[PDB]
């Protein structure tokens with residue numbers, strides 16, 4: 001079970017993982033050119049776990065020079081409950097802290113009941129009830 | 138009324154503007170080293186307006202390779218209602234779009250009644266009622 005940085009050549013394996021994971025919504029930004037630019041901008045910040053040449057978990061992460069933003073946290077069903085998500089999260093947050101990023105955010109759809117439950121259970125995170133988000137249309 | 142890119146040398150003027158503007162909360166990340174690293178990561182994406190050698194308006198912006206994030210939108214009280222915030226917004230969004238960033242976010246405190254009113258009035262933005270935000274503690 002090798003934890004390592006995601007690189008551009010991982011795109012087919014990660015896109016396949018995302019595609020087969022209920023609860024992960026694929027969008028335009030998940031396609032190769034966006035992935036390539038993301039990794040060039042955020043090198044070493046996104047992580048995956050592989051075993052026997054297969055990718056079994058991932059966490060995409062990056063920052064804007066002020067805050068961290070994490071996306072597409074996945075552990076394959078066969079490898080859940082082993083602490084892999086927590087392992088990736090601890091490592092991403094450490095790397096972000098090295099780069100001067102002391103606060104990070106995740107966005108979770110209200111309709112994603114299982115994801116909400118996961119994030120409410122992480123004691124190092126808090127659901128924000130003090131802010132509104134406005135986004136471009 | 139000259140609109141231009143913010144550079145590192147603008148820190149004293151911008152910090153002074155932020156400091157004298159009710160509704161702008163100053164934090165650690167507003168100090169010079171964070172500002173310097175932010176501008177290196179996001180060159181030309183933050184803007185200011187100056188007239189007669191004085192900075193009268195600003196908008197800080199950046200991105201993580203996936204989404205845009207804007208903050209510290211300010212127009213000096215003597216120059217409000219002249220479209221300066223809209224001018225900066227249009228230009229930042231255009232520059233973000235050139236960089237492949239098609240969706241941007243702002244976080245606005247629930248208690249910030251005037252800022253909420255401003256953002257609700259921008260027809261190119263929408264208040265999100267479909268997501269929860271979790272942040273590191």
Ligand SMILES: CC(=O)SCCNC(=O)CCNC(=O)[C@H](O)C(C)(C)COP(=O)(O)OP(=O)(O)OC[C@H]1O[C@@H](n2cnc3c(N)ncnc32)[C@H](O)[C@@H]1OP(=O)(O)O
Nearest residue numbers: 023072073074075080081082083084085086115117118121
């Ligand atoms: C990425 C976003 O911003 S939202 C999208 C989140 N991802 C998904 O919804 C994809 C589908 N789900 C998954 O891939 C997995 O269920 C994950 C990644 C959420 C969790 O994977 P796991 O292997 O359970 O995580 P891990 O074992 O590291 O969990 C850390 C702790 O969180 C807690 N936890 C995990 N899942 C849940 C849950 N659904 N509800 C409450 N608490 C949970 C557990 O206490 C766990 O400790 P453990 O190791 O003793 O079980």
Ligand SMILES: CC(=O)SCCNC(=O)CCNC(=O)[C@H](O)C(C)(C)COP(=O)(O)OP(=O)(O)OC[C@H]1O[C@@H](n2cnc3c(N)ncnc32)[C@H](O)[C@@H]1OP(=O)(O)O
Nearest residue numbers: 160208209210211212217218219220221222223252254258
């Ligand atoms: C940065 C964030 O994410 S939140 C923090 C926002 N910033 C602040 O609260 C700092 C204090 N406030 C300010 O500096 C200013 O009042 C600003 C920047 C919010 C607005 O400055 P203004 O000079 O009004 O900007 P501008 O004229 O470009 O406003 C655009 C339009 O928004 C609307 N608008 C502006 N302020 C408000 C308001 N308080 N309520 C409702 N609508 C408004 C108007 O329709 C205005 O039309 P106009 O372009 O014809 O003038």
